[PDB]
Short mmCIF file of C-alpha atoms in Angstrom, two decimals:
data_model
loop_
_atom_site.label_atom_id
_atom_site.label_comp_id
_atom_site.label_asym_id
_atom_site.label_seq_id
_atom_site.Cartn_x
_atom_site.Cartn_y
_atom_site.Cartn_z
CA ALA A 5 109.77 69.54 57.65
CA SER A 6 108.59 72.91 59.65
CA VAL A 7 104.87 72.13 61.29
CA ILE A 8 104.55 75.60 61.53
CA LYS A 9 103.01 76.81 58.50
CA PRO A 10 103.22 80.43 56.66
CA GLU A 11 99.21 80.12 57.59
CA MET A 12 97.92 79.09 61.45
CA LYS A 13 94.95 79.38 62.29
CA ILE A 14 93.66 79.87 66.44
CA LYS A 15 90.96 78.37 68.23
CA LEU A 16 91.04 79.83 72.20
CA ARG A 17 88.82 79.95 75.28
CA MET A 18 89.13 82.03 78.34
CA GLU A 19 88.24 82.11 81.35
CA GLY A 20 89.00 84.09 84.44
CA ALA A 21 87.17 87.29 86.76
CA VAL A 22 88.80 90.30 87.62
CA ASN A 23 87.43 92.23 90.85
CA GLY A 24 85.27 89.78 91.56
CA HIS A 25 83.86 89.16 88.32
CA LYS A 26 83.83 85.87 86.02
CA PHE A 27 84.36 85.72 82.38
CA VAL A 28 84.30 83.29 79.13
CA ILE A 29 85.83 84.49 75.61
CA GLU A 30 86.40 82.39 73.14
CA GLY A 31 88.41 83.30 69.81
CA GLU A 32 89.37 81.84 66.02
CA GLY A 33 91.42 83.77 64.25
CA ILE A 34 94.62 83.46 61.37
CA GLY A 35 97.60 84.80 61.56
CA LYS A 36 101.51 84.49 59.63
CA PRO A 37 104.04 83.51 61.75
CA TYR A 38 107.06 84.29 60.74
CA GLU A 39 105.78 87.88 59.56
CA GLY A 40 104.85 88.30 63.25
CA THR A 41 101.17 89.37 62.05
CA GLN A 42 97.50 87.81 63.49
CA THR A 43 93.94 88.88 63.71
CA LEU A 44 91.47 87.75 65.99
CA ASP A 45 87.33 87.65 66.33
CA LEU A 46 86.64 87.46 70.19
CA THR A 47 83.24 87.05 71.80
CA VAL A 48 81.74 87.18 75.57
CA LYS A 49 80.62 83.91 76.27
CA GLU A 50 79.89 84.38 79.78
CA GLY A 51 80.06 87.59 81.94
CA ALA A 52 79.00 89.97 79.35
CA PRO A 53 78.62 93.42 79.51
CA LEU A 54 82.22 93.31 80.98
CA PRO A 55 82.82 96.30 84.04
CA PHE A 56 86.30 96.25 83.48
CA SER A 57 88.51 97.88 80.57
CA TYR A 58 89.03 95.24 77.68
CA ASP A 59 92.20 96.04 77.19
CA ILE A 60 93.86 94.68 80.45
CA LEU A 61 93.25 91.34 78.68
CA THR A 62 94.64 91.79 75.60
CA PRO A 63 98.44 90.76 75.58
CA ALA A 64 96.57 87.08 77.11
CA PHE A 65 95.03 86.88 73.81
CA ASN A 67 101.52 83.65 71.56
CA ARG A 68 105.33 84.88 70.44
CA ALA A 69 104.98 81.22 67.70
CA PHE A 70 103.75 84.69 65.56
CA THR A 71 107.51 86.78 65.67
CA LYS A 72 108.75 87.67 63.01
CA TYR A 73 112.65 85.80 63.97
CA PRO A 74 116.03 86.63 62.27
CA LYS A 75 117.49 83.18 61.00
CA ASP A 76 120.05 83.99 63.58
CA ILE A 77 118.30 84.41 66.83
CA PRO A 78 117.05 81.54 67.66
CA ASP A 79 113.16 80.89 68.13
CA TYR A 80 112.38 78.80 71.15
CA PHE A 81 109.01 79.31 69.89
CA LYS A 82 108.50 77.64 66.49
CA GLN A 83 110.69 74.97 67.69
CA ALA A 84 108.27 74.88 70.51
CA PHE A 85 105.78 72.66 68.39
CA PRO A 86 104.38 70.15 67.68
CA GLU A 87 103.90 69.32 71.87
CA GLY A 88 103.94 73.37 72.63
CA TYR A 89 104.78 74.76 75.50
CA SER A 90 103.04 77.66 77.81
CA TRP A 91 103.41 80.58 79.56
CA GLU A 92 102.85 82.38 83.32
CA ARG A 93 103.03 86.51 83.15
CA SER A 94 102.04 88.52 86.26
CA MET A 95 101.18 91.88 85.61
CA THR A 96 101.45 95.15 88.41
CA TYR A 97 100.02 98.35 87.48
CA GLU A 98 100.81 101.95 88.54
CA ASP A 99 98.00 101.52 91.57
CA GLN A 100 98.95 98.30 92.79
CA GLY A 101 95.72 96.44 90.41
CA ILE A 102 97.68 93.20 89.19
CA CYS A 103 96.74 90.36 87.72
CA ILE A 104 97.85 86.59 86.97
CA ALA A 105 97.56 85.07 83.37
CA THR A 106 98.80 81.49 82.01
CA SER A 107 97.84 79.87 78.03
CA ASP A 108 98.73 76.47 77.95
CA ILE A 109 99.53 76.68 73.60
CA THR A 110 98.81 73.56 72.04
CA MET A 111 98.91 72.63 67.68
CA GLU A 112 96.49 69.83 66.21
CA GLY A 113 97.63 70.34 61.40
CA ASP A 114 97.19 73.60 61.10
CA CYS A 115 95.42 75.62 64.10
CA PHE A 116 97.05 76.53 67.26
CA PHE A 117 94.49 76.14 71.08
CA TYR A 118 95.17 77.83 73.57
CA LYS A 119 93.27 77.38 76.98
CA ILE A 120 94.37 81.09 78.51
CA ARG A 121 93.27 81.50 82.80
CA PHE A 122 93.26 85.61 84.04
CA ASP A 123 92.93 86.59 87.47
CA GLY A 124 92.93 90.64 88.16
CA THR A 125 92.06 91.79 91.95
CA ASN A 126 92.47 95.00 93.58
CA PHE A 127 91.83 97.38 90.83
CA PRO A 128 90.42 101.20 92.64
CA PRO A 129 86.60 100.88 91.08
CA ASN A 130 87.07 105.02 90.44
CA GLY A 131 90.69 104.34 88.78
CA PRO A 132 91.17 103.94 84.71
CA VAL A 133 90.34 100.15 84.32
CA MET A 134 87.19 99.86 86.67
CA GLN A 135 85.89 102.86 85.09
CA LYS A 136 86.84 101.79 81.48
CA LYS A 137 89.15 104.98 80.52
CA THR A 138 91.88 103.35 78.52
CA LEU A 139 92.15 103.65 74.67
CA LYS A 140 94.74 101.67 73.96
CA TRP A 141 98.41 99.47 74.42
CA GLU A 142 101.40 101.77 73.48
CA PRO A 143 103.74 99.89 71.69
CA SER A 144 106.59 97.87 73.67
CA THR A 145 109.69 96.33 74.07
CA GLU A 146 109.91 93.14 75.58
CA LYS A 147 113.88 91.75 76.92
CA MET A 148 114.26 88.03 76.23
CA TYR A 149 116.45 85.72 78.20
CA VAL A 150 117.11 82.72 79.55
CA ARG A 151 116.73 81.84 83.35
CA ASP A 152 116.22 77.77 84.87
CA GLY A 153 116.20 76.38 81.71
CA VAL A 154 112.80 78.44 80.47
CA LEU A 155 112.68 81.93 78.79
CA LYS A 156 111.41 85.24 80.40
CA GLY A 157 109.92 87.99 79.21
CA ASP A 158 110.10 91.46 80.74
CA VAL A 159 108.39 94.66 79.85
CA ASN A 160 107.38 98.30 80.78
CA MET A 161 104.38 98.93 79.45
CA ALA A 162 101.48 101.50 79.37
CA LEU A 163 97.93 102.08 78.44
CA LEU A 164 96.91 105.26 76.79
CA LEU A 165 94.51 106.97 78.65
CA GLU A 166 91.45 109.33 77.56
CA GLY A 167 92.83 112.85 78.32
CA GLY A 168 96.45 112.09 77.20
CA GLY A 169 97.63 110.85 80.76
CA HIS A 170 99.27 107.09 80.80
CA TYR A 171 98.47 103.96 82.96
CA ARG A 172 101.39 102.33 83.47
CA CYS A 173 101.96 98.42 84.08
CA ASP A 174 104.99 95.38 84.99
CA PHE A 175 105.15 92.81 82.82
CA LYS A 176 106.69 89.98 83.61
CA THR A 177 106.29 86.32 82.19
CA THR A 178 107.67 82.49 82.39
CA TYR A 179 107.72 81.00 78.54
CA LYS A 180 108.34 76.47 78.88
CA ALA A 181 108.28 74.23 76.04
CA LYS A 182 107.09 70.93 76.61
CA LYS A 183 110.57 69.92 75.16
CA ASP A 184 114.27 70.69 74.93
CA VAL A 185 114.85 73.18 71.93
CA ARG A 186 117.96 75.17 71.67
CA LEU A 187 118.03 78.13 73.85
CA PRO A 188 118.06 81.74 72.25
CA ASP A 189 120.64 84.61 73.74
CA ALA A 190 119.00 87.50 75.31
CA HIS A 191 117.16 89.66 72.57
CA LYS A 192 114.85 91.88 72.17
CA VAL A 193 110.86 91.34 70.99
CA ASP A 194 108.94 94.88 69.38
CA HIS A 195 105.07 94.24 69.66
CA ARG A 196 102.38 96.69 68.70
CA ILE A 197 98.73 95.72 69.79
CA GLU A 198 95.12 97.10 68.54
CA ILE A 199 91.77 96.09 68.85
CA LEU A 200 90.77 97.05 65.09
CA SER A 201 87.01 97.18 65.45
CA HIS A 202 84.39 96.32 68.93
CA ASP A 203 80.70 96.57 69.40
CA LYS A 204 78.96 98.78 72.22
CA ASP A 205 80.05 96.04 75.57
CA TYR A 206 83.32 94.52 73.61
CA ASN A 207 80.84 91.55 72.94
CA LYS A 208 82.48 91.47 69.98
CA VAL A 209 86.69 92.55 69.82
CA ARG A 210 88.90 91.71 66.24
CA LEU A 211 91.88 92.32 67.98
CA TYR A 212 95.53 93.02 66.08
CA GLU A 213 98.94 92.60 67.21
CA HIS A 214 103.06 92.47 64.91
CA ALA A 215 105.70 91.10 66.75
CA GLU A 216 109.46 91.53 65.85
CA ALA A 217 112.32 90.44 67.05
CA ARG A 218 115.99 91.75 66.96
CA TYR A 219 118.95 92.39 69.04
CA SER A 220 120.29 95.18 70.56
CA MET A 221 123.36 94.41 70.55
CA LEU A 222 125.73 92.52 67.91
CA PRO A 223 126.75 88.05 68.58
CA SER A 224 130.10 88.22 70.01
CA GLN A 225 133.47 88.26 67.72
CA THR B 1 119.34 117.43 88.17
CA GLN B 2 115.18 117.07 88.81
CA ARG B 3 114.05 116.73 92.46
CA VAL B 4 110.52 116.77 93.75
CA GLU B 5 110.51 119.04 96.53
CA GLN B 6 108.41 117.93 100.17
CA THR B 7 107.32 120.90 101.51
CA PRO B 8 107.49 120.28 105.54
CA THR B 9 110.68 117.91 105.84
CA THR B 10 109.12 117.82 109.38
CA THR B 11 106.73 119.19 111.52
CA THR B 12 104.76 118.99 115.23
CA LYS B 13 101.22 119.45 115.32
CA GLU B 14 98.08 119.30 118.27
CA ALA B 15 95.63 116.58 116.88
CA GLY B 16 92.02 117.90 115.33
CA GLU B 17 94.47 120.61 113.36
CA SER B 18 95.00 120.24 109.78
CA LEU B 19 98.19 119.97 107.27
CA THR B 20 99.23 120.27 104.35
CA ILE B 21 101.86 118.77 102.48
CA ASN B 22 103.17 120.43 99.05
CA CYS B 23 105.54 118.55 96.27
CA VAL B 24 106.78 120.50 93.56
CA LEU B 25 109.28 119.66 90.89
CA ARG B 26 111.72 121.56 90.65
CA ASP B 27 115.05 122.04 88.33
CA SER B 28 112.96 120.16 85.18
CA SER B 29 111.99 120.40 81.55
CA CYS B 30 108.77 117.54 82.37
CA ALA B 31 105.46 117.54 83.56
CA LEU B 32 103.57 115.01 85.91
CA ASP B 33 101.11 112.80 85.39
CA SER B 34 99.99 110.44 87.39
CA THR B 35 100.44 111.08 91.52
CA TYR B 36 100.41 108.46 94.82
CA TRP B 37 100.85 109.50 98.31
CA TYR B 38 101.85 106.93 100.73
CA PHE B 39 102.49 106.75 105.15
CA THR B 40 105.04 104.64 106.79
CA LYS B 41 104.18 104.70 110.69
CA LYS B 42 107.63 104.03 112.46
CA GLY B 43 109.93 101.45 110.99
CA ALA B 44 107.20 100.09 108.48
CA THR B 45 108.66 99.97 104.73
CA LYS B 46 105.64 98.73 104.70
CA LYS B 47 103.17 102.06 102.51
CA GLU B 48 99.49 102.51 103.06
CA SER B 49 98.24 103.91 99.89
CA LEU B 50 96.64 106.80 101.04
CA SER B 51 93.03 106.85 98.20
CA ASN B 52 91.11 110.68 97.76
CA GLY B 53 88.09 110.71 100.37
CA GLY B 54 87.55 111.30 104.26
CA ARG B 55 90.16 112.98 106.14
CA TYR B 56 92.43 112.79 102.92
CA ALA B 57 92.20 116.17 100.15
CA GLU B 58 94.31 115.22 96.74
CA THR B 59 94.62 118.29 94.81
CA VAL B 60 97.22 118.64 91.85
CA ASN B 61 98.54 122.25 90.67
CA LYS B 62 99.95 120.77 86.16
CA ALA B 63 100.89 124.29 85.06
CA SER B 64 102.73 124.61 88.33
CA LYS B 65 104.15 121.21 88.82
CA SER B 66 102.58 120.87 92.85
CA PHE B 67 100.46 118.03 94.11
CA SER B 68 99.42 118.22 97.72
CA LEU B 69 97.93 116.66 100.39
CA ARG B 70 95.58 118.39 102.88
CA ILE B 71 95.46 116.01 106.11
CA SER B 72 92.35 116.88 108.08
CA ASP B 73 91.10 116.00 112.33
CA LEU B 74 94.62 115.44 113.51
CA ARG B 75 95.42 111.76 115.52
CA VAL B 76 98.14 110.58 117.48
CA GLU B 77 97.70 107.53 114.74
CA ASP B 78 98.85 109.96 112.10
CA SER B 79 102.07 110.07 113.15
CA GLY B 80 104.67 109.18 110.93
CA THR B 81 106.80 109.63 107.78
CA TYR B 82 104.03 111.15 104.57
CA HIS B 83 105.59 110.34 100.56
CA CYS B 84 104.76 111.78 97.49
CA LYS B 85 105.38 110.08 94.05
CA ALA B 86 104.62 111.41 90.78
CA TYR B 87 104.74 109.67 86.89
CA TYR B 88 105.96 111.67 84.37
CA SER B 89 104.27 112.70 80.91
CA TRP B 90 105.16 111.32 78.20
CA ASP B 91 107.40 113.72 75.40
CA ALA B 92 110.04 113.49 73.00
CA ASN B 93 111.83 115.69 75.80
CA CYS B 94 111.49 113.33 78.35
CA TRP B 95 110.94 110.00 76.86
CA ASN B 96 113.49 107.31 78.36
CA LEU B 97 111.37 108.37 82.21
CA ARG B 98 107.57 107.59 80.38
CA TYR B 99 107.75 104.75 82.98
CA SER B 100 109.75 106.15 85.76
CA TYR B 101 108.62 107.81 89.19
CA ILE B 102 110.05 110.31 91.61
CA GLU B 103 109.64 110.63 95.37
CA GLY B 104 110.06 113.88 97.98
CA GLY B 105 112.33 113.51 100.73
CA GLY B 106 109.40 112.61 103.06
CA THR B 107 107.45 114.97 105.68
CA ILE B 108 107.92 113.56 109.04
CA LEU B 109 105.39 114.45 111.31
CA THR B 110 104.72 114.23 115.07
CA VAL B 111 100.78 114.25 116.32
CA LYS B 112 101.20 115.81 120.09
CA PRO B 113 98.51 114.48 122.21
CA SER B 114 94.97 116.50 123.24
CA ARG B 115 93.15 115.23 125.66
#
């Protein structure tokens, strides 16, 4: 009876601004929600060439794509067909700051995202505006219930040209549009990578792998 | 038992003079990654981020695990506490510090008025 199929497509639109520079990016893709994998093809529709590291955007481009075990309730799959939304704050070690939101809906075999992204106070000679980032390091997100919704906190870091890192504190609130069975505290391990890009990142292929797990055995 | 040793701990200087503050990671098998400097005017926990440039010259010596701030043309307004903060290089030996920072004990600077 589950509306979330073994293969689901993705259509999205991001509108945002980083240090005053406006942009629109549209996306289409496909993934395997029960295997926690997905690939997206992303195109800059307005604001090309982007004057900032693409990597600050990539975690904004759906925890429905997470391999959940049967003994951890799946907040995100239970949320469909009606859907869910998330709001995220991202605080970098050099006082760069981003806020992002996504409204996630579904029609047939396809997820639809409307994403808003805003970033400011990135230093002109830092790694974001000089485009010195290489990739996000693999991460572990702590998932926990507060105020009847799901919170996620994750320590994130971009590897930089030269082998250094650029750290970020991510805090997310996930809000389903209907009553669902809430999980106990658990973790989600993530890997995200740009598989391919053109020169100015006007065209980007993006892959994510996410799996949920307990950090402690259930209560006895 | 890692510590950042910051020197000088306290200093009095005359206006127009220069000050070097030194921060050294001691008793550590970890290495320095990013480095940052902050100013606290008397009282204020609000941190003013000192960028390399103008009267502030920020240098790093990775081999010595030290970083330093040189302030030129000191003013009475420069009076207050200077703080250094470092993050750690990612490596297997210091893996659980890879998102953490460490700060010096701080430098309390008094700039005596001249003219």
